[PDB]
Every structure is written in C-alpha cells, then in structure tokens.
Amino acid sequence: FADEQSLVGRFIHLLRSDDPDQQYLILNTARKHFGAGGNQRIRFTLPPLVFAAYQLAFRYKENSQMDDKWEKKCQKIFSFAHQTISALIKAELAELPLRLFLQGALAAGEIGFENHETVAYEFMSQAFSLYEDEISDSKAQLAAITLIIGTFERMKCFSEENHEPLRTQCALAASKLLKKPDQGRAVSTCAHLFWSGRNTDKNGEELHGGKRVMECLKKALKIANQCMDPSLQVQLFIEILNRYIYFYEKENDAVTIQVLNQLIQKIREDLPNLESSEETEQINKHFHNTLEHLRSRRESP
Amino acid sequence: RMLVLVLGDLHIPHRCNSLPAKFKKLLVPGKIQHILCTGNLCTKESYDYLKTLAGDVHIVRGDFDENLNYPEQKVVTVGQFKIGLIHGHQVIPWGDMASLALLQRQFDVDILISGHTHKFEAFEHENKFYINPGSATGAYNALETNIIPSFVLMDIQASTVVTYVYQLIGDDVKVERIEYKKS
Amino acid sequence: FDDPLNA
C-alpha cells in the first residue's frame, strides 16, 4: 500500500506540463480512480492530488487575463479538493486531513478568487472539527494547535466578523489542553494572533491588539504558577518572559518595563531553588542569555 | 576539516517527484561528512537517499513527515560549533527573524538552522548565525510563488563556518557564500 | 566561484 507513491509522484510532475483546463479533467479522472484504491492505499495516494489541486489553482490565477472564469474554476478546484480530503477522513484519518485543510485555507487566502473568504473559513472550520473530534493524544493536540495558530496567523483574507471566530476558538482550544505546560505554551503562542495576525477590516495592517496580548501571557503565567514542579515552572517563566521581550521589541506600548522587572525578579527568587544537572545548566544558560540580550543596547532599567 | 550538508523541505512526493537534475548530479557520496536535514522528506525513500550521501544523518520532524521517529528539535555539535536543528513551523511567525533568535537564546546554539519557509536566508544577528536552505527541490509554498530550489553546505574549519548556497536560478546553478566566525 | 563539489 506504500508503493504507488512515486508513481503518482511521477504523474503529478509530468502532467504539470499541460493546460489548466485539461489539468482539471485529468485530476478529476484520477480522483474516483484513485479513491477506489481503498482505505489503505489512499493514505499515500491522495495528498499529492490535493497539493496538485492547490498548485493548479495558483496556476489558474496566473491566467487571470486569458480567462474570465478563473474564479469559478478555482471554486471548482477547492470544492474538489474538499471532497478529496473528506474521502481521506472517511478512512479514519485524524492528523493528515487537518494539515491538508489548513493548507487549503492558506492557499485560498493567498489566491483571492471570488468567494474565497467563505472557502478558507470552511476549511479552517473543518480543521477545528477534526481537532476537537478525532485527535486525543496530548502530544498530538499540542502539535496540531501550534500548527493551527501558525497557519491562521499568516492569512489576511478574513474580516473581523470572520477573523474573530478562529481567534477565539484558538484561544479556547489552546486553553483546554490536557497537560499544564502544554496549556501554558499554547496560550503563550496565542498572543501572536492578537498582535501580528492581520484582517481585511484594517485594509491590510495588523490588529496590533497590544492589551489583549498581555492577557494571554498573564494567563500563561497563572498556568505556570500551577505546574507544581519547580524545574518546569522556572522554564515556563523564562519562556513567557522571552515572549514579553518579543512584543516589547515590536513596540507594544502595553508591555511595561515594570512587568519585565517583576517577572525576572520571580526567576531570580526561585532559580537557586534547583540543584545541579544538565537540565538546570541549560535553564541557567537560557536565562543568562536572555539577560545578556537585555544588557545589549541597555535602554531603560 | 569537516563539511556538512544542510537541506530540507524536499516534499517527495507531495509536491515533488525528485530533486533537480543538476542538483542530483552535484550531490555525490564521499565528499559530505555530515548531513543535517530540517524539512519533511515525507517518505523514508528520501531518507535512504540522504543516508546514501553520508553516514551521520540528522533529521527532525516536519509538519508533513509520516515517519514515526524524527525528533521535533535537535541540537548537534560538529567539531566545536553548537548547531541547533528545527524544521521551523513551531517558530511562529514562520519567517519571523526575531522569533528565531529567541529559539537561539533558549537553545544556546552558535548556529540555528530552520526551514518551512522554502525561502533561503543566511544571516548573522547578535553574533549568532541563522541558515534556512529552503527546498532542495523548490517545492510549492502557499506564501511564495517564485520559489528557487536551493541547498547550503558549511565547512566548519575550526571556530569558522563558511556556508555556500547553491540555487537553480534559471537553468544554471548560481552559488553564493557567507562566512561567520565564532563569537 | 569555488565549490566543494563541481562548477
């Protein structure tokens, strides 16, 4: 079942030499054709078909003047790729169709055909649906939610009514992780959507939500205060502190220098509270490097 | 005298059947002492290719790697240089330079190398060195439409990395070099 | 330019 790979990998390259009009028909013909492979072979046989659909949609935008229906054809491409990934879900597949839906949303956001906002929103909605339903391992949940936040932070096709659902659902899903360190890391990662992530209502510029950013980090510190393991606790404090540094260096006026001082004070308070090991040597070097960065171009206290 | 090969994001066979011919010709066994791979060579086939090129192969899990073993992040030493390995999809924003240097601080590596951007970048910041080869096969990236296949190899002398970058610009392979010496 | 490989 792991053999036809390169075969399709061959068919996908050579076919890229034809015409997009024909390229749709050939992909469509390989569709029911390859889906008849079974619940075993399509694991390695349909992902190339999905990526070929996305690539061909970009190619259709390439001919935006030589074709007046490239928007309609792109709606066709993304609906066909939706059906293709849903077929991958039918064979009980949790983590691969999730990334495929995220990639579909990213591509639809960049292409910019007519009705592409709804398509990208729908792909993201299914990404969250597979995240809630079928992914249960803590490690896989953390990896998936980090993937969702990274992907979602980069697209700028949503309006605030459409941008806010995924923002808040990222906040909730990341906050409902199993382990406590996982929760802290995901909530800390969530600030990037409020700061860097863009939306259409600002005509392209980022939200620059400075004050919501701190609320995410402040919730991560409250979680770090519940780790019940000094070694891991202090590490979470150093990580969260470096997130504070990241936003302060990007002109987040709501990141007061005093918060930096209090947070570094807690670490100096309970850093000697651990004993020698390789792990503590790395933790000490992490913190020492963070301060030595602060000392570089010494600005304020 | 040691030379290593850093390459990733081949995406075989999701978006790429195989590497570019000129590339395939330039990578021959024996010359390359170590191989540091970042991206997702989605199938073990390409892993056995990288094991053909050299004996010490170091890969890290990417977002699309169906494998069962690759670690999310690795820190390996070559000679005297501390090298950090990570694909780069957990380094949010994906291409953020300020976010990568943060990983450097946490890692305490002298050279931190990542991918998932499919854009090659080699720069020195805060007296530390950051390298992103990109896709050796010039795979598809949703955010960049004019992608140039590239890879990088660094010959760690002794407290001195020289990094050469091969690129398939047009038809012929154009190369560039950036140098960095230990802090 | 130079190369540990070919031209």
Side-chain angles (χ1 to χ4, degrees):
Chain A
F1 323 120
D3 53 288
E4 273 146 318
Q5 314 213 70
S6 210
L7 185 162
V8 192
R10 256 196 214 95
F11 164 102
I12 288 305
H13 183 293
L14 278 292
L15 170 143
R16 303 250 300 291
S17 306
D18 281 314
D19 195 80
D21 295 48
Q22 274 314 280
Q23 273 213 70
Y24 181 32
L25 167 55
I26 292 68
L27 281 170
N28 216 339
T29 57
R31 173 80 212 291
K32 190 208 144 252
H33 165 182
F34 280 123
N39 298 345
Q40 315 194 283
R41 293 141 270 270
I42 78 184
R43 316 169 86 89
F44 316 76
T45 296
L46 292 203
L49 272 283
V50 170
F51 282 128
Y54 297 156
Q55 264 162 320
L56 159 74
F58 272 90
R59 179 107 147 93
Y60 264 116
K61 164 173 169 244
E62 252 188 44
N63 296 349
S64 164
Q65 62 254 10
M66 202 165 98
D67 208 330
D68 281 39
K69 334 182 71 173
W70 58 286
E71 292 153 319
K72 281 86 140 178
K73 312 195 73 47
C74 282
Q75 305 199 17
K76 255 206 159 178
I77 313 282
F78 280 107
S79 166
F80 149 60
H82 193 314
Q83 301 174 8
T84 295
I85 317 184
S86 285
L88 262 173
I89 286 175
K90 295 212 191 132
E92 178 47 29
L93 274 172
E95 290 215 72
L96 175 50
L98 190 159
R99 285 77 180 284
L100 291 199
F101 277 120
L102 290 188
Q103 291 282 334
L106 203 30
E110 312 284 308
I111 292 194
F113 50 95
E114 100 177 3
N115 268 344
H116 75 315
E117 224 197 292
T118 300
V119 168
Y121 188 119
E122 159 76 35
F123 274 75
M124 289 281 322
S125 286
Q126 318 264 335
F128 278 98
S129 266
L130 289 100
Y131 164 89
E132 264 151 356
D133 305 7
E134 310 259 27
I135 189 155
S136 96
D137 183 317
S138 176
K139 295 333 161 183
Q141 278 217 288
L142 175 278
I145 176 59
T146 279
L147 261 173
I148 317 184
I149 283 134
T151 298
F152 176 46
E153 177 273 359
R154 289 285 82 183
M155 72 212 72
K156 43 174 192 260
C157 36
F158 286 142
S159 81
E160 190 73 14
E161 45 153 16
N162 293 332
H163 192 329
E164 171 216 347
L166 304 117
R167 219 201 286 137
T168 81
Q169 183 115 18
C170 285
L172 321 173
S175 149
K176 305 162 196 192
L177 272 163
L178 300 71
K179 287 214 163 137
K180 273 313 191 163
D182 288 8
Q183 208 165 322
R185 268 136 174 158
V187 182
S188 306
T189 292
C190 264
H192 295 270
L193 313 164
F194 303 95
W195 179 242
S196 92
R198 314 181 140 161
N199 73 339
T200 74
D201 281 322
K202 315 263 181 273
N203 252 316
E205 181 146 289
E206 338 183 83
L207 309 150
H208 277 308
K211 214 202 181 313
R212 329 185 215 156
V213 156
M214 310 265 298
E215 313 207 19
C216 277
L217 293 110
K218 154 163 61 203
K219 183 152 211 263
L221 292 133
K222 204 144 81 193
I223 298 194
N225 215 315
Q226 201 167 6
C227 272
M228 311 266 298
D229 175 9
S231 281
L232 222 60
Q233 182 144 50
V234 161
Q235 195 171 23
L236 276 278
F237 285 159
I238 317 184
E239 305 226 90
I240 300 196
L241 191 173
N242 287 255
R243 249 68 173 226
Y244 272 126
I245 307 206
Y246 169 111
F247 294 98
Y248 176 102
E249 301 205 310
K250 295 272 301 203
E251 272 125 25
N252 190 6
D253 301 281
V255 167
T256 82
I257 184 143
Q258 185 71 352
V259 191
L260 278 57
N261 290 345
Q262 327 174 205
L263 188 52
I264 179 173
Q265 198 180 269
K266 261 186 84 179
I267 288 163
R268 301 212 217 220
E269 285 175 20
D270 321 320
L271 208 60
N273 238 34
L274 319 180
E275 314 294 311
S276 46
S277 183
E278 167 127 24
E279 66 182 280
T280 182
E281 183 138 290
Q282 289 127 347
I283 294 199
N284 258 6
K285 255 136 79 189
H286 181 5
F287 187 92
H288 272 199
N289 260 269
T290 291
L291 279 177
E292 193 146 45
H293 166 31
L294 288 180
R295 290 176 185 136
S296 319
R297 253 40 181 180
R298 186 192 262 100
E299 92 266 19
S300 188
Chain B
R1 195 57 205 303
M2 51 206 98
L3 71 179
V4 306
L5 171 61
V6 74
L7 88 161
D9 308 280
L10 317 171
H11 269 238
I12 291 137
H14 289 227
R15 322 162 199 191
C16 264
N17 36 293
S18 98
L19 307 85
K22 301 240 195 128
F23 272 63
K24 267 187 179 299
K25 174 155 191 161
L26 304 187
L27 311 84
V28 311
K31 314 173 161 263
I32 293 135
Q33 280 263 294
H34 281 19
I35 286 202
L36 290 213
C37 175
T38 62
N40 42 36
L41 71 175
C42 314
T43 45
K44 177 139 147 264
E45 205 199 338
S46 317
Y47 172 45
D48 299 281
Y49 184 53
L50 309 206
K51 204 92 162 203
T52 289
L53 293 165
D56 218 15
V57 173
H58 295 313
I59 318 185
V60 287
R61 153 143 31 198
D63 55 336
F64 267 104
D65 256 358
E66 50 102 343
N67 281 239
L68 262 173
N69 162 76
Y70 309 152
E72 206 141 291
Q73 63 214 0
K74 194 183 261 153
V75 74
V76 68
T77 323
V78 180
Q80 71 260 78
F81 264 14
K82 237 187 193 70
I83 308 194
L85 210 53
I86 207 174
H87 180 214
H89 68 265
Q90 331 95 326
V91 157
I92 318 185
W94 287 356
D96 213 38
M97 302 135 268
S99 211
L100 277 150
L102 162 63
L103 212 67
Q104 182 287 283
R105 294 197 240 79
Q106 151 158 45
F107 267 13
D108 192 331
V109 310
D110 296 352
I111 310 203
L112 172 143
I113 48 185
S114 75
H116 184 98
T117 312
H118 300 208
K119 265 212 253 180
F120 150 87
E121 289 153 339
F123 53 59
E124 155 200 310
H125 163 286
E126 261 205 45
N127 313 275
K128 303 321 211 193
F129 206 46
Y130 304 128
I131 308 304
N132 177 321
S135 49
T137 82
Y140 158 74
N141 196 19
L143 307 143
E144 182 46 286
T145 85
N146 208 259
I147 208 164
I148 296 156
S150 74
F151 65 99
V152 154
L153 69 138
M154 322 175 308
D155 67 331
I156 298 148
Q157 263 282 344
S159 186
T160 325
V161 157
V162 198
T163 80
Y164 309 72
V165 54
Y166 304 84
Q167 295 176 282
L168 211 63
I169 318 184
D171 319 277
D172 230 8
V173 179
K174 302 217 239 139
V175 181
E176 182 207 351
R177 154 202 190 262
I178 288 305
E179 67 141 359
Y180 156 101
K181 324 183 161 213
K182 193 163 180 93
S183 88
Chain C
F1 212 77
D2 213 2
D3 275 317
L5 317 194
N6 314 337

